[PDB]
Amino acid sequence: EVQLVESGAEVKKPGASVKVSCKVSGYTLTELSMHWVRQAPGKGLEWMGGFDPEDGETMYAQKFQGRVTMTEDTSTDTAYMELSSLRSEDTAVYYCATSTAVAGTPDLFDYYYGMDVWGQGTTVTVSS
Amino acid sequence: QCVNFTNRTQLPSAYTNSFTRGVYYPDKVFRSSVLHSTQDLFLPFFSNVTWFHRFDNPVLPFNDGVYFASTEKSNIIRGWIFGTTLDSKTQSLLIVNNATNVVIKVCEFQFCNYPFLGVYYHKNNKSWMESEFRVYSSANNCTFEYVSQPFLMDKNLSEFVFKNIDGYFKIYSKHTPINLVRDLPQGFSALEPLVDLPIGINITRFQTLLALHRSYLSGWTAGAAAYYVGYLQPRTFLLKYNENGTITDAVDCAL
Amino acid sequence: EIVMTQSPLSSPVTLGQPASISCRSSQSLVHSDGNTYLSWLQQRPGQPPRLLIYKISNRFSGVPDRFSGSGAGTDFTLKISRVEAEDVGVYYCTQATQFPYTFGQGTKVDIK
Ligand SMILES: *[C@@H]1O[C@H](CO)[C@@H](O[C@@H]2O[C@H](CO)[C@@H](O)[C@H](O)[C@H]2NC(C)=O)[C@H](O)[C@H]1NC(C)=O
Ligand SMILES: *[C@@H]1O[C@H](CO)[C@@H](O)[C@H](O)[C@H]1NC(C)=O
Ligand SMILES: *[C@@H]1O[C@H](CO)[C@@H](O)[C@H](O)[C@H]1NC(C)=O
Ligand SMILES: *[C@@H]1O[C@H](CO)[C@@H](O)[C@H](O)[C@H]1NC(C)=O
Ligand SMILES: *[C@@H]1O[C@H](CO)[C@@H](O)[C@H](O)[C@H]1NC(C)=O
Ligand SMILES: *[C@@H]1O[C@H](CO)[C@@H](O)[C@H](O)[C@H]1NC(C)=O
C-alpha cells in the first residue's frame, strides 16, 4: 500500500520559488502516476497537474501553465513541484495524490487513470 | 529495498526418487562407442531428492554440489544465490536470468532476508522492469561479472548441476520435454556443460531466486514454484558413449 | 473542459437512513479503453480526501460495504445504505478520462 509524506508549510515574500515535496513509500515513484491538487479555504479543490501514463508524461492545467513545474527524483522517490510568481490568491493547501500507472500483472495489463492515494497537504501561505 | 514479509511459512517439501537423472558430461573429450568409467561428483541413482512445492525459499546447504530441477512454464524461477554467510562480510555469487540474457555476478552482496526478483511497471520507458535491489541492499568490491545467453528457457523439465571445485564454478544444464508433473521422469538424459567460471570463492549454502510481480489492483503477489534439489557425492559411474558421442546410458557402480 | 455538477449541495440525514448523491457530467465519460474512470472521494474535516469508489461501482481496498455506486453515461449515483457517525463530511465525484481532471462542487452530509 502506498504511503505519502509531505514537506513543511511555508511563507515567503511574493516573487520567489516554491519547493513542495512528496515522498512515497511502499511503492517506488516510477510505478506511480503523480498528481498535484490545490484546495483553497471556502472553495472546492481543483486539479493543478499530474502524470499522463501514456502518449506523454506530464499534463498541466490551462490556468497554471508557465508557472507550475513538476519533477521527480527516482533516487529518493520524491516528487517535487514548484511554482513562481506568487499571487495573494494562491494561499491554499496543496494535496499530493497518486495512483498506479497500470492495473494488473505483466500478463494482461491495462492503463489506469485515477486519483487514489492522497497525502496530507502543505499549507502554502503568501504573506508580508 | 528489502521487503519484509509477514506470516512467512516454511515451503512444503516432499521426498521423491531421482531415478537416473542428474548425469552430466564429466569432461570435454569426444568419445564414440565406448564404456568410460569416471569417478566424480555425481548424483547417486534412486536417491532422495527433496521436492519443494506466501512461502519462503529455504537457504539450503550446498555440500559437494547441487542437482537442481524444475518443471514450470511461468518463469518464476530466475536464478540462484551462492555463498557462505550471504552478507557483506564475505563474497557471494548471484545468477539472474531474464528474457534476453543471463547475468552471473560475484560481489560482496548484502542480501535481503527475503530475496526475490521484483517485476514492476516503469512509466518513463513504459514497460515492466526487474529490480535487483530487491535481492540485495548493496553490492560492493565486486570482482566478477559475466553476461551470456540465458539458460532458463524451454512441460519442459530444466535440469542443472552446480559444482564448486578447485577454483572453478561449473554449471551443467539440460532441457527435456516431459509429460508428467508429480515425479522426476524415467529414461536417461545427460547434462551438457554450460559454463566453467573462474570464481574461486567459498560456497556452503544456496538459495533459489523467484520472480515476484506487483498485483496493481503484501504488494508482491506471485505463484509458488516447485523445484527438485538433490546432492552430489564422490562416486564412480560407467558412462556409455554411442557412435555420435552422446552419453546414452550409465551404471552407478555403488548401487 | 468537462464540468461536473453535483446534487444536492447539502444533505441532512439521520442515523441509518440511506441517502443518494447525484453527479452529472457535461461530456460522456466513456474512454477509448472502455472503462469509464469515475471516482467518488470522501473528505473529513481536518483530513485529506481519500478514495471511496473507483470506476463507477468498484470498491477500494478497505472501504466498508455500506457504500455503493451505480450509473452510466452522464448520470451517476452514490448510495450510502446505513449512515453512521464516521460518514460526516464532504463528498466529491471526479473523472479521469479527459485532461484536465475535474471535480464536482462537493456535497456536505451531517448527522443533525
Ligand atoms: C535483462 O538483463 C539485462 C542485463 O542485466 C539488462 O540489460 C542491461 O540494462 C542496463 C540498464 O540499467 C544497462 O545499463 C546495461 O547496459 C544492459 N546490458 C545489456 C547487456 O543489455 C536488461 O535491461 C534486462 N531486461 C529486463 C526487461 O529487465
Ligand atoms: C529416503 O527414501 C526412502 C525410499 O522411499 C524413504 O522411505 C525415506 O523416507 C526417504 N528419507 C528421506 C529423509 O527422504
Ligand atoms: C529504460 O529507460 C532507459 C533510459 O530512458 C533506456 O536507456 C532503456 O533502454 C529503457 N529500458 C529498456 C528495456 O528499453
Ligand atoms: C570492501 O567494502 C567494505 C565496505 O563494505 C570496505 O570497508 C572495504 O575497504 C572494501 N575492500 C576494499 C576496498 O578492498
Ligand atoms: C568456508 O565457509 C564455511 C562456512 O562459513 C567456513 O566454516 C569455512 O572455514 C570456509 N572455508 C574457507 C577456506 O574459508
Ligand atoms: C547418430 O548420427 C547418425 C548420422 O548423423 C544418425 O543417422 C543417427 O540417427 C544418430 N543417432 C544415433 C542414436 O545413432
Residue numbers in the entry:
A (entry chain H): 20 to 147
B (entry chain A): 14 to 66, 78 to 178, 187 to 249, 256 to 293
C (entry chain L): 21 to 132
According to the publication:
Given its crucial role in the viral replicative cycle, the spike protein represents an important therapeutic target and is a critical antigen in host immune responses.
Here, we report structural analysis of the NTD region in the Gamma variant, stabilized using Fab fragments of the NTD-directed antibodies 4A823 and 4–824. Superposition of 4A8-bound wild-type and Gamma NTDs reveals remodeling of the antigenic supersite N1 loop25 within the Gamma variant but not the N3 and N5 loops, which comprise the majority of the 4A8 binding site. Analysis of nearby mutational effects provides additional reasoning for conformational remodeling of the N1 loop. Namely, F18 and Y138 form an interconnected network of T-shaped pi stacking interactions with each other and the adjacent F140 residue. Comparison of sidechain positioning between wild-type and gamma structures in this region reveals steric clashes between Gamma residue Y138 and wild-type residues F79 and L18, and between Gamma residue N20 and the main chain of wild-type residue L18, resulting in differential positioning of D80 and F79 in the Gamma NTD.
